[PDB]
Swiss-Prot record:
It comes from Homo sapiens (Human). This is Bifunctional 3'-5' exonuclease/ATP-dependent helicase WRN. Monomer, and homooligomer. May exist as homodimer, homotrimer, homotetramer and/or homohexamer. Homotetramer, or homohexamer, when bound to DNA. Interacts via its N-terminal domain with WRNIP1. Interacts with EXO1, PCNA and SUPV3L1. Interacts with PML (isoform PML-4). Interacts (via KBM motif) with XRCC5 and XRCC6; promoting recruitment to DNA damage sites. Interacts with RECQL5; this interaction stimulates WRN helicase activity on DNA fork duplexes. The gene is WRN. Belongs to the helicase family. RecQ subfamily. The chain holds residues 527 to 945 of 1432 of the full protein. GO terms for biological process: base-excision repair; cellular response to gamma radiation; cellular response to starvation; cellular senescence; determination of adult lifespan; DNA damage response; DNA geometric change; DNA metabolic process. It is found in: Nucleus, Nucleolus; Nucleus; Nucleus, Nucleoplasm; Chromosome.
């Protein structure tokens, strides 16, 4: 149940352009705030939990323009393709765009326009014309935590986006961050000059993720044996699989062992060229590769709808990273599994890489997130209950209540059902 209720036209539009029958409560909280109150928002949201509807839906519903600012060009191009397949006109606007498309943007032919921050600052006159002639429903600043010098993903062009509010005072900004850090949120608010923004978060309503934690020996094939099946003289996983490793070195070691089994896999980390990463990601989406072994940072992400298995090979960096990374599994809604294989000696459990972080408020935050991860690894409680417990106030959705306690929820619920 949603308050205030979406009207029938809003629901029909949701069905027709996004294929969803109802809004998630937090999606509606952002959407309604933008449409009715023209309110700035800081949306603490992760891919895989329903992030994109919050900024793609409003311009589609009113038939106007939504501007999405992001530094991740390849991801923006993929979104343009997906939107066009869902019959939503969208484009990437850059220096190379044809005048026919640029005039089409001015005529309001496109609902969603993706731009880089750097383009955005050099063409503010264009944005004001768009607002005057057509109306900008919202500006979404994706990867907004890149504004912060200490957030390990600093991109200085984001700090120029303070000009948006001055040029377009009546246009709400939705700043999307995948960290709940208060110091980063406060910097986002002040740098962008947001006004009394609404703060929201995705939660953990992902009932199709089975969660398991088990101890790791550190012998790679022994640890990976339960996930591997030999079929016709060939080793394979049961389905498309991501293995997240804490270090690039571990990613290469794991990949090396799997290649000796003639397994179809690819590595994915920030040391690789962009062109090679793009190829690996495309091959995984098209099922030419079965397993990606990744060390995720800097807004690298793996976007594939039918990821059946996620394996954290070693303790995750912290509780937010873990939440981000399991969220990438099972986006088609079918059953998926997320396993953590960990050991006390794991480097993310022996982090002096925090004892070196410069910013004091941020270091306290990361220490807190690491403590949460450690408590989770050691717990006998329902893993889903633990994750949800970190969203103190937040309502638990019915589907999550229904899965908890059953054999498909987590390893600890399964153990309870056995005895
Ligand atoms: C917003 C959610 S709420 C309960 O409505 O205030 C809030 N988020 C969190 O407190 C929060 C806590 N813990 C975790 C996690 C997964 F690390 F355990 N996530 C989390 O949140 C998010 C963090 C990253 C991405 C999405 C959500 C904000 C502080 C106000
Ligand atoms: N309003 C909704 N109703 C039902 N399921 C939803 C809704 N919004 C998102 N989802 C589901 O949540 C998951 C995450 O959304 P998805 O579109 O894959 O990515 P993103 O989080 O980047 O928007 C998917 O499984 C998707 O089907
Ligand atoms: Na659906
Ligand atoms: Zn459980």
């Amino acid at each position: 149940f949603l308050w205030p209720a979406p009207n029938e036209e809003q629901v029909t539009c949701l069905k027709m352009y996004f294929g969803h029958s109802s809004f998630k409560p937090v999606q509606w909280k952002v959407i309604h705030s933008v449409l009715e109150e023209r309110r700035d928002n800081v949306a603490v949201m992760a891919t895989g939990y329903g992030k994109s509807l919050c900024f793609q839906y409003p311009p589609v519903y009113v038939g106007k323009i939504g501007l999405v600012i992001s530094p991740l060009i390849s991801l923006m191009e993929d979104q343009v393709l997906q939107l066009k397949m869902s019959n939503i006109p969208a484009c990437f606007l850059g220096s190379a765009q044809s005048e026919n498309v640029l005039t089409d943007i001015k005529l309001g032919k496109y609902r969603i326009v993706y731009v880089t921050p750097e383009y955005c600052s050099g063409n503010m006159g264009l944005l004001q014309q768009l607002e005057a002639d057509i109306g900008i429903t919202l500006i979404a600043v994706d990867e907004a935590h890149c504004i912060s010098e200490w957030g390990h993903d600093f991109r200085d062009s984001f700090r120029k986006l303070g000009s948006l509010k001055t040029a377009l005072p009546m246009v709400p900004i939705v700043a999307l961050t995948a960290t709940a850090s208060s110091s980063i949120r406060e910097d986002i608010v002040r740098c962008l000059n947001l006004r009394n923004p609404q703060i929201t978060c995705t939660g953990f309503d992902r009932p199709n993720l089975y969660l398991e934690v088990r101890r790791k020996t550190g012998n790679i094939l022994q640890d990976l044996q339960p996930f591997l099946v030999k079929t016709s003289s060939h080793w394979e996983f049961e389905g498309p699989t991501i293995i997240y490793c804490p270090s690039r070195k571990m990613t290469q070691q794991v990949t090396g062992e799997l290649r000796k089994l003639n397994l179809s896999c690819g590595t994915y980390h920030a040391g690789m060229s962009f062109s090679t990463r793009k190829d690996i990601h495309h091959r995984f989406v098209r099922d030419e590769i079965q397993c990606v072994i990744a060390t995720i940072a800097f807004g690298m992400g793996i976007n594939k709808a039918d990821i059946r298995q996620v394996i954290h090979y070693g303790a995750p960096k912290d509780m937010e990273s873990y939440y981000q990374e399991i969220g990438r599994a099972g986006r088609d809604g079918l059953q998926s599994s997320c396993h953590v294989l960990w050991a006390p000696a794991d480097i993310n459990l022996n982090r002096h890489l925090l004892t070196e972080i410069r910013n004091e408020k941020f270091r306290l935050y990361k220490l807190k997130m690491m403590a949460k991860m450690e408590k989770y690894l050691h717990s006998s409680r329902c893993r889903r209950q633990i994750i949800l417990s970190h969203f103190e106030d937040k309502q638990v959705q019915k589907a999550s209540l229904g899965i908890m306690g059953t054999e498909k929820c987590c390893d600890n619920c399964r153990s309870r059902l056995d005895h």
